[PDB]
Design a protein around this ligand. Structure first.
Ligand code: O28
Ligand code: GLU
Ligand code: GLU
Lengths: 260, 260
């Protein structure tokens, strides 16, 4: 029919530029979990497709004043892209404006520390000031804290929203570089999937600590009412049941472990 | 509008008869995780409802010859019930004939043993004959093995389908009673959620061993195209984000732990 325009985001190890990408063209420029998943979904649904990186490098949030959606969510809502194949969290506010498959991977919000940081829990973080902590801008983690009615998580948000200098970061890599370079004086709140990946990468100086703060999943997103949604959803379930999702997770997380 | 007829199944601790049920009428007869969830969903969607236990006591499978659906799935498909609020696994074959919300709880297939049984893995089970092992009839676990192309799980199925006497059981309670009463000579394959619940109940003689064999979730099911599906799905996401699902899990699993 028509080539399907896929929006995605540069986020390890879902979508990464191959080291030799300036030598490559089109879909061949990229590798990772979501690059592989896109090729599986496409095969099972019978479409040809083009991968594109979201212009603003964001997941998706709605401006309070303009009410405009940014990121991959905005690309779907305003008709710039036909499908999002990315670590995109299923949330109530997003479900209302886009379609999502059943989840292809489960996760929760988690804590990342530099090795040796005296912190074991979110409750530990909330009761101290010496170690700063923050989250990614324009995604589900920031919103979880902003919206929470649970005491510990409200205390956290009150602190983070007024901390100087800013505790918030524009990309996952900035958050990680901040943990590494702050000598245990910054902790980062990020999704368990990303945290477990980073923990198995050189220089092997970060760690996931304590249990997850919530339980949720990523799904494949389509514009609301798109005829793509039904076969994409059946494709996610078939790959789940065939053990292909588990095979891909092991490929990109633990087969590529550098820390033992 | 009309009172919504809910199908569910007697399965601990999702839906259980209160000890004093012969003194009680209607929805008051029952307690558990899914009894509580039904009351939350109903409040958030603005409907009145009646709980009913599935007549044949089954989850749902399709006969190879007649192609008739049994269990709760059959109740939905043939229009006997308006909604299923139960530990009902989201699978490809079911998604095709009924509607499902996003998952309200995640699980995987797991192994239950009598304490002291020399078994740590599915691979351990497959390489021996002394200890029998089986699954529930008419659900997702049996079908996982019947359909699997993974060597270890195919070896398992080849054994189970021809074992004498039968390794299969009609209810979870039969499976558990068989583990308890077989002196370590039977192991039971069941969902991790049910396994972890039983492990915290007297006489505290069973255990979950090894990692889960797959990763999946339960969802709330509606007849295909029902106008109930959309608000029910938004209700599951809101309760997730409010921490109500986590609150209910702790209530029925670990607050009621009898083994420490
Ligand atoms: N509460 C949950 O466990 C829950 C989720 N649970 C899961 O994602 C578990 N889960 N559920 C499924 C599926 F539903 F069978 F598709 C799969 C997985 C993981 C592996 C792929 C298949 S996603 C999600 C929630 C609540 C908020 C909305 C997003
Ligand atoms: N997966 C998240 C982004 C990462 C985060 O917020 O921690 C989202 O879809 O917004
Ligand atoms: N939750 C399963 C039933 C239990 C099992 O198969 O282990 C189903 O919906 O079929």
């Amino acid at each position: 029919n028509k080539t399907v325009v896929v929006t995605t985001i540069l986020e390890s190890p879902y979508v990464m530029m191959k080291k030799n990408h300036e030598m490559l063209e089109g879909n061949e420029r990229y590798e990772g979990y979501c690059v592989d998943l896109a090729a599986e979904i496409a095969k099972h649904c019978g479409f040809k497709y083009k991968l594109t990186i979201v212009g603003d490098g964001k997941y998706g949030a709605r401006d309070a004043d303009t009410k405009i959606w940014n990121g991959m969510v905005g690309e779907l809502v305003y008709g710039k892209a036909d499908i999002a194949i990315a670590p995109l969290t299923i949330t109530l506010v997003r479900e209302e404006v886009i379609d999502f498959s059943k989840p292809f991977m489960s996760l929760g919000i988690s804590i990342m520390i530099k090795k040796g940081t005296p912190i074991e829990s979110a409750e530990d973080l909330s009761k101290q000031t010496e170690i700063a902590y923050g989250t990614l801008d324009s995604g589900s983690t920031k919103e979880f804290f902003r919206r929470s009615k649970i005491a510990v998580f409200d205390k956290m948000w009150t602190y983070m929203r007024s901390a100087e200098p800013s505790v918030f970061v524009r990309t996952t890599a900035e958050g990680v570089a901040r943990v590494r370079k702050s000598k245990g004086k910054y902790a980062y709140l990020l999704e368990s999937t990303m945290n477990e990946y980073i923990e198995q990468r050189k220089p092997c100086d970060t760690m996931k600590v304590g249990g997850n703060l919530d339980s949720k999943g990523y799904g494949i997103a389509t514009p609301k009412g798109s005829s793509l949604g039904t076969p994409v959803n059946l494709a996610v379930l078939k790959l789940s049941e065939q053990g292909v999702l588990d095979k891909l997770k092991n490929k990109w997380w633990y087969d590529k472990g550098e820390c033992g």
